[PDB]
Amino acid sequence: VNEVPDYHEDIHTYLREMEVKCKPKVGYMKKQPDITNSMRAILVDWLVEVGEEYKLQNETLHLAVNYIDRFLSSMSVLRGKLQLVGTAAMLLASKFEEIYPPEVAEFVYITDDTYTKKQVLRMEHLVLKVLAFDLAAPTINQFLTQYFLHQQPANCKVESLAMFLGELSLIDADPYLKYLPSVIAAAAFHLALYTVTGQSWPESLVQKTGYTLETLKPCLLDLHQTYLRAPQHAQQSIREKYKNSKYHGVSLLNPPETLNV
Amino acid sequence: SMENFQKVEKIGEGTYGVVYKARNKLTGEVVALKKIRLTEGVPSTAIREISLLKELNHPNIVKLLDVIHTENKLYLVFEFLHQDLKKFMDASALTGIPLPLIKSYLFQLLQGLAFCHSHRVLHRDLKPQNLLINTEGAIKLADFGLARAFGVPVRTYTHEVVTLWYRAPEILLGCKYYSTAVDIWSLGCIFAEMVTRRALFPGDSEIDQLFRIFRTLGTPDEVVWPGVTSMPDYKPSFPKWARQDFSKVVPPLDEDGRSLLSQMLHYDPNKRISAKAALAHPFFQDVTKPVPHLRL
Ligand SMILES: CCn1cnc2c(Nc3cccc(Cl)c3)nc(N[C@@H]3CCCC[C@@H]3N)nc21
């Protein structure tokens, strides 16, 4: 009943549909005159830090990122205001998803008084207007937790390693903006399964999703490379986070040298 | 937008905001306005209601028509409905509600609830004050202030949920997780209430509520509900009341109604009937949609 057997299939179908409607414009960053993929990389890494400081759910982070990409898909923003957008997004996400959201005043504190409370609250309203209140977006995590139900024997290092890889994809718009949440989550699940147990993407998820190892190959290649290059990446907050016992220190596990794909 | 609406009268106060009846001057449409005043920005209560109700279009869920964002206030424009079920039950206190109407309203509430659960949404406050009815014979789920989008499987959500009288045993006993079953419990308490015109478990505290439920359905043990003996707020010193016949719990109800109600009030959330399966139950064999019997 906690896995809602009577409804999980209707819910998966619904999320596949919404995934397409909540998609950011794939090539939004070139039409932004003052900001770059490098600057958004810095911002997402900062949000991961904020999430660990205030002990927020991982879903909260994934949602915030979705709100940011959609807002920037239609609104030009100067480099000096990118942090104000990102802070409002995290406030909106916490209000939606958290049992105990932090107060507005703590969202002002974590910006080092770069912005006023009046500014944060007004940016909240503008983000709502731009998104037309469509805040219940599907995320990588929403698919991943469903996929986890198809394990022979459930395995905690598999689950935490898929979460970590999914989270890594949030930092790099190029090229993860061209892949849908359900696909990135499928690549991350297969890659975690293989790395830990040597197993592959099961026939039961071929049946649920329609996705095969061949249709996942493109995203699965980019994600392999991201995993390999992670100790060298300019932003390290996710690797640091997944050292914790809470996530079974999975960022210490060595990636495989090759895929067999 | 706001200059086309003419306020008619106040209706009353909800979970949050205040509700008015009003008229669209150009179009003729009668609507219900929920006014929310703008401390902390936009309340999470409204963020959830607005986002979830925009996604949910069904004939047994109240329709959200527009959001008017005047930066000093927020106005929610809704289809107008003539009464709630609670008030209608008082208007039928002597006389009763005819059985074909109870059957119709239970059937429609299950359709609406099945639709919520298929779209990843938990109501959380299903009671007769939150169920709205019209002249043509419809009933609709309303008030999504306490609602919440869930994941599969569910995580730990807020504990301080559902009005006391309609609150499921798994919430009362402090379980880590609750799911869709919580809304079915409430709907079962309501079905009994339509038949009887008085609440089925009217407790005055968390512990009295629990004791009233155990007195009617039996104190649960490990055979009827595996795990109950280990729940955080279970106490070995609870009294062990015997379970009474359901023919005594709701005396006027036929054999089919009793079957359905027992299945909706099952102790174990894993065995409790789903809204989707309840639509196929023999109770609804002959169902229709008559108009209410009194004026609204
Ligand atoms: C916002 C969606 N909505 C549409 N129509 C609504 C409504 N209708 C009426 C009209 C006249 C009497 C009554 Cl009890 C309800 N009441 C209503 N809420 C009131 C608020 C407190 C009094 C009881 C009822 N739940 N909400 C309604």
Residue numbers in the entry:
A (entry chain B): 172 to 432
B (entry chain A): 0 to 37, 41 to 298
What do the authors say?
Members of the cyclin-dependent protein kinase (CDK) family have diverse cellular roles that include regulation of the cell cycle and transcription and, in certain cell types, differentiation (Lim and Kaldis, 2013, Malumbres, 2014, Morgan, 2007). CDKs share a conserved protein kinase domain that comprises a smaller N-terminal lobe linked through a hinge to a larger C-terminal fold (Endicott et al., 2012). All CDKs require binding to a cognate cyclin partner to remould the kinase fold from an inactive conformation to one capable of phospho-transfer. We have used biophysical measurements and X-ray crystallography to investigate the ATP-competitive inhibitor binding properties of cyclin-free and cyclin-bound CDK1 and CDK2.
The purine-based CDK1-cyclin B-selective inhibitor CGP74514A is a less-potent CDK inhibitor, and binds with reduced affinity to CDK1-cyclin B and to CDK2-cyclin A under these experimental conditions. A comparison of the binding modes of each of these three inhibitors to CDK1-cyclin B-Cks2 and to CDK2-cyclin A reveals that each inhibitor exploits very similar interaction networks to bind to both complexes, consistent with their comparable binding affinities measured by ITC. A relative displacement of the C helix in the CDK1-cyclin B-Cks2 complexes compared with CDK2-cyclin A is consistent with that reported previously (Martin et al., 2017, Brown et al., 2015), being far smaller than the displacement that accompanies cyclin binding and accommodated without affecting contacts made to the inhibitors described here. Our structural data show that cyclin-bound CDK1 and CDK2 form the two conserved hydrophobic spines. In total, these elements form 133 and 145 inter-lobe contacts (<4.0 Å) for CDK1-cyclin B and CDK2-cyclin A, respectively.
